[model samples]
Structures are given as structure tokens and as C-alpha cells.
Target: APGVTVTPATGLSNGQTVTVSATGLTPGTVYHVGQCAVVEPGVIGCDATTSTDVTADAAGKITAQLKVHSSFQAVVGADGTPWGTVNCKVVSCSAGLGSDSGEGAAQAITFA
Candidate 1:
């Protein structure tokens, strides 16, 4: 499964930048970094501005940065504020069955 890590994991405010590092992906593949704004509990909307396009290295690794925008509001669940989260994964392409186009586990980042 693919994995991702973000620097400065907590206390993130709006406009702050975070470094995103990912591994266990398909080498030389194009990927997208997308954000879903937490509109309400169990509800989210796609944040258009935070979307990013990247390509994985030969070792199936990617290093990128994403800005925390106003759209990424915090989510308050029964567990209290769980923070906002963004998803990153490789884009699927039209390929035959058993193709590597199948994406790996989605990478998620939770913000303050």
C-alpha cells in the first residue's frame, strides 16, 4: 500500500504550508493531490484550489508541498475537532484488466 507523511503534523493554521512526502507508489506515474473541505460532520466538498499535479520518481516516491487554505475548515466530530484532511493518490488511467493503473491506498493528511 502507498503511504504519505506530512511535516509539522499539527497546529496548522490557514495559509500555512506543509511538506508532503509519499512512497510505495508506482514509479514514473502521474498523481494528483486533492483536498476535501470539511463542510460539516461526515460531509466534505472538493477544494478546487489545493489540487496539485505531480509525478512519482523512479523509486515510487514523491515530495511535494500544499498550502492550507480557507476552504479547509476543521471538522468537529464526537471525538472533537479531528482537523481537516487532504487526499493524495495516483490518477487512474484507461488500461486493460490487471493493469497497474489501479491506485494504491489513498494518502491522507490531517491538518489543525
Candidate 2:
């Protein structure tokens, strides 16, 4: 659930590649991974449809690289608060093949 880190932690441009490293997971488990842009504060639209499927190793560790979508950009709320955020997380797997509570958390990255 912890020990997950994303490189280039800030200032992520569209189409740029970033590495996702996660540890302390279930072995042989596959997780959905990708980025999402916040349409509104606390409202997230992730690229689950195009997210990568990664299987954890025997040590319950996995590393993967995901590209920031070109269409993903920074957004702002009507109140003038910063709203755009790129997040990487372990998501629900299609076909009921993964954990109900997916691991990992969304890391804020700059995308424009």
C-alpha cells in the first residue's frame, strides 16, 4: 500500500515518460496503472481505458513507465484555484481480475 514513488515528481509535460515504482504489494498480482487529469477539484477522470496492466513480482514490487497524454493539460476552477493534476495509481482491473481496493495513490504532476 505504501512505498510507491514516481520520478520527475513535478513539471511533467505532455507526452513525457515517467517511471512508477511500487513495492509491498501482493505477489503475482496485476494492477491497472495510468494517469488522470482532474476535471474539477476532487473529481478525477483517469485513463483506465488505456492504462497499462502490470504484474507484481514475487517480492511484490513493480516498475513501469507511462506517458502523459498530450490532451492532458492544466485546469483551473471557477474560483481560480488550481485544479489540474496528473495522478498515477493502481486501478481496478477489468473482468473482475484484481483487488477491490487498488493500491497506490495519484501523484500530482505538471502537464501542459
Candidate 3:
């Protein structure tokens, strides 16, 4: 895994406000935007992250924006601040959870 890439095919919808667009990548080097949520059957509950050293536009799209900071609740005040923000596409510019650990990348996205 040169930097890991799975959970793609479409993302950013849990809490909305997510942006991690890429395209060929590898321009200035350094990338690692993570978020997870998929407990059990493989586990995945990502957290909030942001790593921007961008400089790719010559065809390698580079868009970084991580917002949606709440989603994933079991019963905390009836989901009153769970948390949401798990977009994938990394090169290790932020070095989040060493690679992935937003609760194992469950991609939780609601608790407000």
C-alpha cells in the first residue's frame, strides 16, 4: 500500500462538508486525508483530519477540505454530537492515525 486507497467509488455524505479530491496525485508529495466508519464485519470509524501541502493542478486534481465534525452516536443524549468527517485519499501529508483510525474507519457522520 503506497499510501492506501480504499473506500472510494464515492464518499462525503455523512455530515456533508467534505472535500478530498485527487487525480494522479504526487505533485509536491505528502498526502494523507483519512476518515472511517464501518464497525464490525471489518470495523471502521474514522475521525477528523486535514493535511495540505498541495501543488497539483496540471491534471492531478488537488482539493482538500475536511469539515463535518460530528457523527456516530449510540445514545449520547440521543445523538447530540456524534461526529462526521471521513474522506479517503492519502499520500501521508497529515499522517492521520498512522494511516486509519477514525474508529477503524466506520465513516460515522451524525450526532448533532
Candidate 4:
């Protein structure tokens, strides 16, 4: 199975940049990536501004960066449609890669 990792994975502060790296992907494939507030393995909210994408290189791997912001609790959309049932600040959050449909690894986020 493929996997993702959130670098500096613990006790981070607001506005810090964390690396979202993935391996064992389909070569030349583009994968959606981002930070999310998780409810179990399901993502309740993802920061849209930078919850972006990366195409796998020839080695079937990817590397991307995302800013860990306090505002992520609100998600990044005008309508708040992707908003989560809980705030990442007060609850659990994580960085994810591959499919948004729950086929990837989720590494937890910890804020200081």
C-alpha cells in the first residue's frame, strides 16, 4: 500500500510549514494533498487554499508543502461547505495524501 508522512509531525505552531511527502504511488499520476481535521479515518474538513496536488515523479513519489495555520479550523471556502463538525484547534487534525476518498495514510497534527 501507498503512504504519506507529515514532517515535524508534533507540537507545531501556527504558520509553520510542514512537508507532505508520499511514496509508492502510481508513476506520473497526480495526487490530491492537504491538511485536514479528521473524524476517525474520515476527513471532516480540509484547508482548501493549500490542500493541493502533486504529480508522482518517475520514482513514484511526491513531495509538497502546506502551511499549518490556526484558521484551518474554519477550512478554506467561501460557503464553509467543507467545514468540519469540530475545530482542528480543539480536536484532532492530520495531513493526508493520495485520495480524498479515504485510500491514504493520515499522520496526526499536534499544535503548540
lDDT winner among the candidates? 4
| Model 1: how far residue 107 lies from native, Å | 5.9
The global C-alpha lDDT for each of the candidates, from Candidate 1 onward, is 0.51, 0.56, 0.36, 0.72
In candidate 4, clashing pairs total: 0
Give the per-residue lDDT digits (tens) of candidate 3, residues 7-111. Answer: 222443444555455555445444445444443344334443322344544554456555433333211121223443333332111112222212111122232
TM-score of every prediction relative to native: 0.59, 0.63, 0.23, 0.78
**Candidate number with the higher lDDT (2 or 4):** 4
Runs of candidate 1 with Cα error greater than 4 angstroms are 37-44, 70-112
What are the per-residue Cα lDDT tens digits for candidate 2 across 13-77? 65677887877778877776666554645654554434577888899887878776545333333
Candidate 4 structure quality by residue, lDDT tens digits, 1-112 = 6888889888888889999888887777777787777554543567776677777889988888888775563353335565544455787778878553445667888887
Tens-digit per-residue lDDT, 1-112, candidate 1: 4777766545455567777677887777777654444354555344445556677879988787767553443333324355554332221111001113546433344434
Q: Pick the candidate with the highest TM-score.
A: 4
Model 3 residue 27 lDDT?
A: 50
Whole-model lDDT for model 1 versus the true structure? 0.51
Count steric clashes of candidate 1.
0
